[model samples]
Target chain A: DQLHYPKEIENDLMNCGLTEKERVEILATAWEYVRCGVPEFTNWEKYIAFVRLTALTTVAEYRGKLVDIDRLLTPGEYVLGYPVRELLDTLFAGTSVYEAMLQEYASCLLFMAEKTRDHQSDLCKKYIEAIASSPSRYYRLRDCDAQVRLFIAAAVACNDLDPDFTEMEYQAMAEIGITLYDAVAFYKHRAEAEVSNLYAYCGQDLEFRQEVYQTARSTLWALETMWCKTVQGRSAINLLKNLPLIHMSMRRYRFVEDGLTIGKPPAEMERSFESVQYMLYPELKEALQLPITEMCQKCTRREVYGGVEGQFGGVVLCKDSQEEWRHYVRSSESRHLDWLGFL
Target chain B: QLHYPKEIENDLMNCGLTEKERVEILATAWEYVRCGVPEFTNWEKYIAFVRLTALTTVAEYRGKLVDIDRLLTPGEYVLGYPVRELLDTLFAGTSVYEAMLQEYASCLLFMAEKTRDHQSDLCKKYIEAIASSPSRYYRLRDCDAQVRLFIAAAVACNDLDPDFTEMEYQAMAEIGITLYDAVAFYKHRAEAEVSNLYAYCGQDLEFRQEVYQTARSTLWALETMWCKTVQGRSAINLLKNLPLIHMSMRRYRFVEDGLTIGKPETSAVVRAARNHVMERSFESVQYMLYPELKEALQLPITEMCQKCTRREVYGGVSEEGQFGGVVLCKDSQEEWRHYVRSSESRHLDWLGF
Candidate 1:
């Protein structure tokens, strides 16, 4: 199936008044972040924060009467004078702090809008261009933080440009499609390492970090194989399957230290030699599905084993044999079906 | 027992008016009262008559043989039981006609001096009612000047209606509704009304000002009514039907429009109780086995095991052992000792091992 916006985020973008093409581009950028192991973008609060920051930067540029996209894309070049991660930290701190920051920035936007005397239509055109250029322009940045900053700047610009959009309108967008199953699966497969890195960078204590990590992993195991059947999980697996080829294609157009160029053709590059049978194997795609199957079995075993194995990270099965595994899975599922209030 | 005006004498002397002028004013007011004029024409004549009546009432209440100059001032003795008794007995018989006339003169002076511009007729009628009725004089007799003034204002607001009669006040007095209690109840009702109005008209500056003025006026009217109709008529009723009284005042319309008098909000106190459950197995093991272990290992008996219950070792059945049963079993004694070793190792980790 063709890639589509997750139902909630699509509705949010619609409420934000983004055009169809603009929504697609924004979704594409969001998909890129998901691929980069940052599933936090899927959360509504985080997504809105990203959009608000984008609008702020866009308005800043519009009021300055400048179109220097390259300078805008540069990391730490804006008047905010903070890294993208630090900004995200403050924005996500708590409701009270976030509200104060929002009011402060809103006042700044109002002043800038007053000074320029520009109509909403002029802002709208510039915002559309900014959103359209973001995905491709974001791909040019080698630094991850710079890529995120540029994405936010583009998203927020769209919101600020729409005359009909209000803060209350954005606030009214309800969380609909994405379920706890999808969220847990995404966090397990992708965002776990990102969370660890963020916690370490933010100077959180070891005990707190361990507590969060253990709780997330425990919840994922508790969810069992149900997460794998979600739309978010299926989409993620598809991306993982095609990631190597996509990376190979993008590498050709990467910016170099000297200057931007199409570096090399894939055909011209040397390939490690392998046997003809290995290269021509008909079941390579089928074999690639094995790891996914193994991961699912691991999740089932975790649920069957209970808290002892969960608390202390150790293998405590009755036996390592397939017969034992089959017997356990069968009995557990059977017991769950028979018991009325199993949970 | 004679009343005096030593303080008033000092006040007149220091008032910047010449002695001749003061005496003339006093004489003119006395002459007006002696001839039974209905009203004094100016404030000076009215004040002079008030001072003269105050002196005469005190002299009649006390004996004639006492030195009046050496006694308490008129303002001081007026608040005493002597003046209270005089007013209460003023309409009892014709034998106290001299004292009754003095009280009549003072009442007229008070009515003329304290009456608001539009309330003169109400004041005159109320004063006339007090003069004729013994029960009305009895209620007015026991109150101070401040309360008396409030009564006149409140009676004026009623437009001298007979519905607020002496019998109604006497009934209120028999059940014991003090002036202070009436003031408290009305203050609470007014506050509730003001709070309700503010909630309805948030952020409207003119509406807020109107609400404020209405609150002040409501309080003033309530105090005035308390003094006029309730003050000396009754004492505070301990078993008061608060809701009944609150509803009955609706006819008076002392509360604002569309507002029901509500009970004032009371703050509630919350208390949290903490109860910690003790692990029975841990307690038994510590009591029965800990001492022996401490002696055998040559460790201090005072050093208790911190990690036994915290870790999974000593609490009920786990992957480890059964509760007190396993520890006491002869065959599993060695296993129990080994468990202690492992528990100690875990405890060391808590101390930065």
Candidate 2:
């Protein structure tokens, strides 16, 4: 979304650790220059070169990122970063580069959790969906890969991510949860992708889901424990969950954005604000001298922020910030039930 | 093992945590009176009842000794306590109450990693083994339960302890490892013994072995991660392991404790020390699991002013000087492992897809 020029990105990567060629490959893959959707490179020699170059470059290019697996990884004697291509090489000759790539890609995503908070949604959901939509789409990558079966298990799990039937989702969830663990050790640290990669599966696997639920629970528990010990509740988990979904719907979904008047009708706007008193916080409403949120929307972005800074691009933040959008989606407890039925 | 009379232990029942009559049965079972263990109370049920009561009672009576569990809401944590009695209903039971206790006892008798010093013997062997053995290692605790089986598994991995035939030792290790894990979850479970007693297979089966290995890996990894983290080692995964003991030995017959309390001279001393060990470690486990716990165990527990402190101890700790040989009163690394590796049971389950 925020594409820096080739020179700038390359420079940024230089400090982080990537070589020019490594940078080129990622950018090439990132931008679809040469690797966009190309089938997994199947040739033994070619796959090695691709993986070797990718690993060396990924660690090299990123700043503060665990860019260099060789250096950052401990127990140097082990194959913590060996190419999944080798696994393919050991398995059979028919496997494709794509299959090897998918497996290795999963490992790398997993390794990220050790160094950073997990955020593999982009990588996992995208490719997994692609494979599921067409398992035989291109025979994906096979031959030469011993991990083909594991990959098959992975693909099935991903596809079942949002199965329609409850039983199907449960079955898929259990399969994926267990297979992901087995897959990595099968390849050892030579395959680092399996680590945190299992996290998203937490949402599906009831047992593993405890970590996330406990994260939220512990937050509440700690607060309560301290309160019971010290006498009160000053903090809440909900502060992290407020947003502008209702307003967003009002705009695109309700055509309210265009309907707002540029001038006059302050009386109607102020009156309309009163309608949302039940929803908007009384404190926020009082600060704005508005009785309701609808009236708060009546103020121009500049008027609300006390000047031009109030307007982001041309739109006003309207107190209910876009930042709140993340919480809005998460708060849709029912929508998550959609996920519960998912594998 | 020395069995406390039921009358004394009933004080624990009065806590309102469990029913009054049930408390008496628990005490009677604990006293080794065998007054009324369930009909199906085989050794597994007996061990569960014996082991859990040891833990629950120690938590109740020796509150300071097992301070951590004493305060837990029984409604919550008691459920986590190995429910040996409850597990009796399922033919699943434990051979010994082991795991972190082995290490905690190790810490009490051996090296107080706190000062990076070897502990003096608690005048006992396993309890005092910490001087040479650093129970702090994840590997040590992981294999500690295998002490009895250590000869066998060590033989398989080419690590058999001295004075044992390699192949025979391997079989013994495999059998030991299998039983340890199997009983912890099955026959000894608090729920099953307390409520749902189980019928023993009347023999043994393959699925029973699977349950053992699962418990082994799960608890092994769990305790390994938490306790070793306190010892300042890089903890292993809380969800990964690949045990290599010979699979055939996985078939095991569990030996429930003859819950009679006796002098530490009998093998039962190992059991009492184990329950005590578990009592203390459970308090600090949450500390280890906390990512920020690096600071907790690392804090200096020793006084710089005191140069001549009694550090390690053997068997049940005896007070020579500063070291009371009490499990908690001291800190060292060497004393920890010896206590852990001393005569432990190593059981395992085959990984199921």
**What are the candidates' interface root-mean-square deviations?**
41.2, 30.0
Sequence-dependent TM-score of model 2: 0.25
The weakest ten consecutive residues by lDDT in model 2 chain A span A235-244
Candidate 2 lDDT by residue in tens digits, B195-307 = 10011111133444333333333333322223212111111111111121111011111111111111122223244444553222323444322221222233233522132
- List candidate 1 stretches off by more than 4 Å: A15-18, A34-90, A94-343, B1-353
By TM-score, how accurate is candidate 1?
A: 0.14
Candidate 1 TM-score for chain A = 0.22
lDDT of 1 by residue, A187-236 (tens): 22232222111221112233433333333222222221222233333222
lDDT of 2 at A310: 12
Name the top TM-score candidate: 2
C-alpha DockQ for predicted model 1: 0.00
